[PDB]
């Protein structure tokens, strides 16, 4: 089901994404934050 | 919920 | 670029633009033809911006030049970024003069401690964006490959190699991706990829370009 993680340039949680530029490269920070509010 | 964002995740690449 | 300096106007005759409506990728003039950049770049079409200092304000004294052919690395991986790095041929050549020039390829791997300077159209903001109108330069240190890999680990190939500093504040962003890290007069990086940008201990990843210097003169050779 869905996955979020903070993106540390827009200051938010963002939905993480098949086929993104490097998504086995991510760091998926402030995972657990992210799930619970979003 | 101002935090959740629609916006595509920026990523790594540069 | 994050924490850097305007470049003296036309100092980096070897730095392109990719342009697809608006910049969003740099690249490196290696010959009259040829242009290496990172493969994440790749775009069906592109149009290379060679002699901009000011990529806002048409000057009269630039060349714009379509992409004939784009050649992303056959190894490249878009989900792991291993590889990084791709071949533009261009339509027509380009003209040499002060502005417009090449860079050397480089003639030994890239080491620990060595001094460089990283350049681009990128944006200069760790958090927001900034895209400056004139071109941004950084010098930088290459990383120990222990630094490279502690600060990401289980991430970093043997086709990538670290650049910057571990304290943050001064990185390559986005929209740097394709152009040069140049270290003593030669080609050694392509701007790849990072966590944020100029986060500490989060540095640069960078492809080695002298991994692929064979790759580079077949592929000039087979597509003459
Ligand atoms: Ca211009």
């Known amino acids: ?38 | 919920k101002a935090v959740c964002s629609q916006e595509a995740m920026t990523g790594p690449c540069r | ?224």
């Open chain 1, 1 to 38: 089901m869905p996955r979020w993680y903070f993106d540390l340039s827009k200051g938010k949680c963002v939905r993480f994404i098949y086929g993104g530029c490097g998504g086995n490269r991510n760091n998926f920070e402030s995972e657990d934050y992210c799930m619970a509010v979003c």
């Open chain 3, 1 to 224: 670029i994050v924490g850097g300096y305007t470049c003296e106007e036309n100092s980096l005759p070897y730095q392109v633009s990719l342009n697809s409506g608006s910049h969003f990728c740099g690249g490196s003039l290696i010959s009259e033809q040829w242009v290496v950049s990172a493969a994440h770049c790749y775009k069906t079409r592109i149009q290379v911006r060679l002699g901009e200092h000011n990529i806002k304000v048409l000057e009269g004294n630039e060349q714009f030049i379509n992409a004939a052919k784009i050649i992303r690395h056959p190894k490249y991986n878009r989900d792991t970024l291993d590889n990084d790095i791709m071949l533009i041929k261009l339509s027509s050549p380009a003209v040499i003069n002060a502005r417009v020039s090449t860079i050397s390829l480089p003639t030994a791997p890239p080491a620990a401690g060595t001094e460089c300077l990283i350049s681009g159209w990128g944006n200069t903001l760790s958090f927001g964006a900034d895209y400056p109108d004139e071109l941004k330069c950084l010098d930088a240190p290459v990383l120990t490959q222990a630094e490279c890999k502690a600060s990401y680990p289980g991430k970093i190939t043997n086709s990538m190699f670290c650049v910057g500093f571990l304290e943050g504040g001064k990185d390559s962003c986005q929209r740097d991706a394709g152009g040069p890290v140049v270290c003593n007069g030669q080609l050694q990086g392509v701007v790849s990829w990072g966590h944020g940008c100029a986060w500490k201990n989060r540095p640069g990843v960078y492809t080695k370009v002298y991994n692929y210097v064979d790759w580079i003169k077949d592929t000039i050779a087979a597509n003459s």
